[PDB]
Symmetry: C4
Subunit: 296 residues, 4 copies
């Protein structure tokens, strides 16, 4: 009869219009977390639902000490409402879970076991020439574990140690932790076994611009050397071949073309500077049930 | 009788050259606030008045425990002088009121009524075509707050809303779009008795798409880049089809020279917004305070 | 008889190679501050002097309780060394003066009298001759002024406190007055242009609208006014090509000038390096 | 004997795949620090090593109270792993040393001697008299005008990575992201009391850092080009307004000789304006980014920051 006051595991569940599944969600999770003999909590983030999902949450909160509600002021999205629950999650390990149980909750028993071996981040991965080209370009930077990338694998069902949650707590990229932040932070990582390449390589471009200044730096010197090769081609060649229209239009279309993507890479990084300096917060909490406001 | 050390309501009245209306304003407010039987405070923000308005404020301060003065260092904006009073206003609900008193102060009896029901932001809009059908689907579900014949400047905000926007520079222009972003429980009450111009309302729709979004900068970067690869590839292909001479040489140099100027506009616009976000300069400066304490110098 | 804990007045002196003036500066200052019957402190900021200025300062520090030394790591300039002196200066009023006494210390008695009346900022501007406030063109108000504690705290975190006379004095407001005493026009509007960029943003928005509307008058003229009149099969080509490339190619450079001007100000606001570095302190405490 | 609570010296060593050198490193260092009779600590930064370097550090940690370990989450640069150790190093003086022992550790006796004399920064530049040429005299004269008499700590065949720093200096640059490249210009900007100690035991990267210095510690590359770019804009604007106001004629002057050059000159100066603007924009992103400089996975013999 020892009353333990420390929380070991946190289950963060972003929910938007999940009124029917609330009965099957909390019940199936209970038969998985009970045999673990580990103190836990369930953080339920209300993402501005209309179908009275909040009223049904307060009923589960009223008869379950492990149910805690984070009511958002409006609909902010899955990635943002999930970050809201992790901020209010004060456990040693954090496991985000979808409400429709697309992944089996029994994998929590497999996530916590590999977590107690020393690994700080534990993933859960399911199982033409584009499949051989994409898988080869990424192993040169991602590292040992790239199976979380190849479709239809998404690392949205994972376990993270408290050290990883606090590290990326102040980073605006914590909303899209799978967009590349997982590979930058490193730590001890592993996974357990159990699409659309147009959007897969859209993250490849979004990752090069976010974690690197190469697109801006490379085109700065590339756009500078062709400016020196420019001004020199009319410096010594003005004291006096002249194809006329065969190069008056070409130079107008070339020198004017290289500037448009120079303004493109500048406007891209400028928009990223605004996102980093803006004072507008990521989300707003309307009400809280079973939790305290932040900062504590 | 017992005492109470918690303020429940805070009204904020920015004042510039309001030497005349002080006697009628406080008398009118007292006959409205006293029947509520609720603890309140009155924040009067002297915004660099020149007609001895402050000298009359201090006299009202001396004889009324509810009067609290925030004297600014110089004359700032009416929106700025309003944010100063909200920063120094304690209490669970904040409602700013004007000094000319175009809207009846008795309307606060119903802003507080909808606030007790659970609504966090309660507007007071006056009663009186394609644009209204536009904003109802993209901007806000309650377009009646920012209608031409009435602006939502007479409103009541809960403490949770005041604290959430305390650090945002957009709190100066809360009606310029920030109200549609914060969410929360919103509702309005309807009443009857420059602005109101349609060019000034779409200026609010233009100032909003740039403040709360990156689309004007993102859609133009991708657009200016795809026309750039068309410009450099068609130039290489033209340097090895039809060569219309002046019918293309004048058009091309004048098209690229014009698309770069608008590209420089969206960059210079967002650069000015990045600048205003990183300034260490505050919105206002407080010269003197009556019945209040200074804010922590951390800021 | 009895002790006093709070300091009322603070005199801040930036010092660079002032080994000689120290005997005459402290003696003449004591002759003016003593009849005031007001507790005071003297903050001396050593701005990397090459001579024996610091050694003579510590000697005056040993035999005078009102002398306090702020030793900067290297030379940072008169403006930065003066901002450092005010940062370490406690006291309801702050009066900065120079070591070479072009500013007569006897004006301190007149600046403190205007401050007693309620003025928050009292300037000491030299008389002009030659051929409110706004004395910023002939000799003009220098760094000789009085500022209440409320003013120095308001602009403490502001980087513009270094150049307080370049425009920040007109932005802060407060109760201001000046005092006249005796004994280039290019720098006039160089500082007037330095102010219209820091406290306005209008030079950026005015050229954004002007640069965009002439981009509308531009694009529309050749997109389908030239395309609609030449689709049938024109203005003097060379006369129209030269006037187009040099009007459009040049207005972009002014757009690049204002954008590059405001980009540098963003870099100065967000840079993490400090304005100065203190090497040693005498009779003071470190910040924060 | 009695106990002392203040640490006088802090030795920081970044370590990446130094499994073999750990035995000789701690042994040779202990024979240099023991005669000093001052309290010291050794901060070891595990910069994501791949072999068993961390396993051997913990054993040395288990039998030496001066050994302290900072295990980074992954492999960063040498400049980053060294800044991580300085953050966790507590002591009146800080001396960074390499693990492969490229410079003799007996110079610590000379660095501490110059530190107690009042110098806040004490360098240890190698004494090399070879390579004296006209290019070595031009760079020396150009760098002496901004760095000072101390500028001798950066000859081509040596740097200033072996140095002593007082606590006042490591605190002054603690929050500065330029602390990693401290020997890229930041040393000349702080301007504390500096000196060096001599011992005997490329020009591409020298002027590449001199170009990286005028952009980092100045705005001249941006301010000079905006003024130079605006004055040649007035020259192109007025000269064009007069060429179009010259109505005393009507097919071409210098036709393709000047018009092809005009689009060329005005099109090249903009690319240089875009270069300096994009360069400083990337610097603004590096200053405002919330992403940290490193991440600590585990600590041995230390506490997490802030204290
Ligand atoms: O706007 C949204 C949409 C998603 N969700 C939650 O995020 C999870 C995503 O599940 P869904 O099946 O709707 O998306 P998908 O499975 O395709 O990723 C669900 O538990 C939702 O409750 C949310 O909180 N806000
Ligand atoms: O510089 C100013 C201008 C206005 N006001 C206050 O804001 C209100 C503006 O009233 P006005 O009739 O001019 O604006 P409107 O009634 O149309 O909102 C007045 O009550 C003033 O007290 C102010 O504090 N400072
Ligand atoms: O690099 C400098 C130059 C100026 N000063 C101080 O600033 C004051 C102004 O002196 P200066 O004659 O050079 O300026 P001016 O008289 O021309 O205004 C003097 O007391 C100096 O001690 C300084 O601290 N560091
Ligand atoms: O990626 C790296 C490379 C360097 N080092 C450390 O930094 C020092 C540099 O050693 P190296 O000989 O490789 O560099 P150099 O001697 O040429 O300066 C070594 O002690 C390493 O332990 C590190 O921690 N991470
Ligand atoms: Mg699902
Ligand atoms: Mg009015
Ligand atoms: Mg002088
Ligand atoms: Mg080595």
């Amino acid at each position: 009869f020892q009353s333990n006051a420390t929380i070991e595991l946190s289950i963060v569940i972003p929910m938007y219009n999940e009124e029917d599944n609330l009965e099957h969600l909390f019940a199936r999770l209970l038969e998985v977390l009970t045999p673990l003999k580990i103190t836990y909590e369930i953080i339920c983030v209300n993402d501005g639902s209309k179908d009275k999902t909040l009223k049904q949450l307060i009923d589960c909160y009223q008869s379950n000490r492990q149910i805690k509600i984070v009511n958002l002021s409006r609909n902010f999205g899955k990635e943002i409402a999930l970050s809201a629950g992790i901020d209010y999650a004060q456990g040693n390990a954090v496991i985000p879970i979808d409400a429709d149980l697309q992944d089996p909750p029994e994998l929590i028993h497999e996530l916590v076991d590999k977590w107690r071996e020393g690994y700080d981040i534990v993933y859960a991965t399911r199982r033409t020439w584009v499949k051989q080209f994409t898988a080869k370009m990424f192993y040169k930077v991602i590292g040992r574990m790239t199976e979380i990338k190849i479709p239809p694998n998404t690392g949205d069902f994972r376990l993270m140690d408290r050290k990883v949650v606090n590290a990326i707590k102040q980073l605006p990229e914590r909303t899209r932790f799978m967009k590349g932040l997982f590979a930058w932070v490193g730590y001890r990582q592993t996974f357990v076994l159990f699409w659309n390449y147009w959007k897969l390589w859209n993250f490849a471009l979004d990752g090069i611009f976010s974690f690197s200044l190469l697109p801006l730096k490379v085109w700065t010197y590339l756009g500078s050397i062709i400016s020196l090769l420019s001004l020199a081609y009319a410096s010594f060649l003005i004291l006096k071949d002249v194809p006329g229209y065969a190069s008056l239009m070409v130079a107008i279309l070339f020198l004017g073309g290289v500037q448009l993507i120079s303004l493109g890479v500048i406007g891209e990084y400028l928009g990223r500077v605004y996102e980093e300096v803006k004072a507008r917060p990521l989300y707003l909490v309307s009400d809280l049930w079973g939790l305290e406001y932040l900062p504590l």
